[PDB]
Amino acid sequence: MDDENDRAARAKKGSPFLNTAQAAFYIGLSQRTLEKMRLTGGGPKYRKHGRYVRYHIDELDDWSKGR
Amino acid sequence: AMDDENDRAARAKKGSPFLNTAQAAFYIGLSQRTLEKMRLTGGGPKYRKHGRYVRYHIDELDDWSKGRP
Amino acid sequence: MDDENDRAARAKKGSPFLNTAQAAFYIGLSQRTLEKMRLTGGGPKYRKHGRYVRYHIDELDDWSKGR
Amino acid sequence: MDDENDRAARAKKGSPFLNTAQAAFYIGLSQRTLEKMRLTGGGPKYRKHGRYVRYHIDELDDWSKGR
Ligand SMILES: [Cl-]
Ligand SMILES: [Cl-]
Ligand SMILES: [Cl-]
Ligand SMILES: [Cl-]
């Protein structure tokens, strides 16, 4: 394989990021449990998109599997 | 046809493939304690640790039921 | 058309599995009869759920219909 | 590795650049939100291609990943 052109072309076709409400529902936790995981750690990697918090679907899945 | 990260994220926004112990036990026809005990004895299905909360992927449940190695 | 989200949602609403007693009553056999068929390597396909034999309703019907 | 011929060959097949609408949708913010951040020094690096703003996908990802 993947170069910058494939990455850009895929990025124009959709998004891999979920918000907190979506990440929590997908992984089967309370939104508040997920938020509290940010502050104490132990939860999945997030991204700070400035103000907003965003979760990359493949980082959710990695965390779930222990990978 | 092979799904990319956009595809996976788009499905994840529409549902969840995970069950808690109580739901997983009901689905497989066992008591919750029996399923919990198998986490100690071994011999039950793969599960995920989502922090301190145990979750079961429905397809890893079906795998275990069907005897996939 | 079903994906992993559909399968989990359905699994959360009930169970397709019968124990030996239920399966026997359903196919019109004694519980003992159904066990011996299993122990002799015959009868319907079943699942080992740990120490507990379980029967999927559709595998029960497949075996009954000889197809 | 790449020589200049390789870079040119790749540039002739695709573009690594997204506009604001595309870049916003990919990182999961509104278009307006992403514009706003151009004034803040919070958001991702951008290129000014004359009058028009463009985001290199790899800089989008570096900013999200916190570099
Ligand atoms: Cl919770
Ligand atoms: Cl039981
Ligand atoms: Cl009989
Ligand atoms: Cl060169």
Numbering used by the authors:
A (entry chain C), C (entry chain A), D (entry chain D): 1 to 67
B (entry chain B): 0 to 68
What does the original paper state about this entry?
The recombination directionality factors from Mesorhizobium spp. (RdfS) are involved in regulating the excision and transfer of integrative and conjugative elements. Secondary-structure prediction of RdfS proteins found in Mesorhizobium spp. suggest that they are members of the MerR superfamily of winged-helix–turn–helix (wHTH) DNA-binding proteins. DNA binding by the RDF alters the recombinase–DNA nucleoprotein complex and often bends DNA to switch the favoured direction of recombination towards ICE excision.
In this study, we cloned and overexpressed RdfS from M. japonicum R7A and determined its X-ray crystal structure to 2.45 Å resolution. We note that the 21 C-terminal amino acids of the protein are completely dis­ordered, as expected from their sequence PPEPGSDDDKGGSGSADEGARS. The biological significance of this quaternary structure has yet to be confirmed; however, the superficial similarity to the polymers formed by other structurally similar proteins such as BldC and Xis may suggest a role for cooperative DNA binding in the regulation of ICE excision, the activation of conjugative transfer and transcriptional regulation.
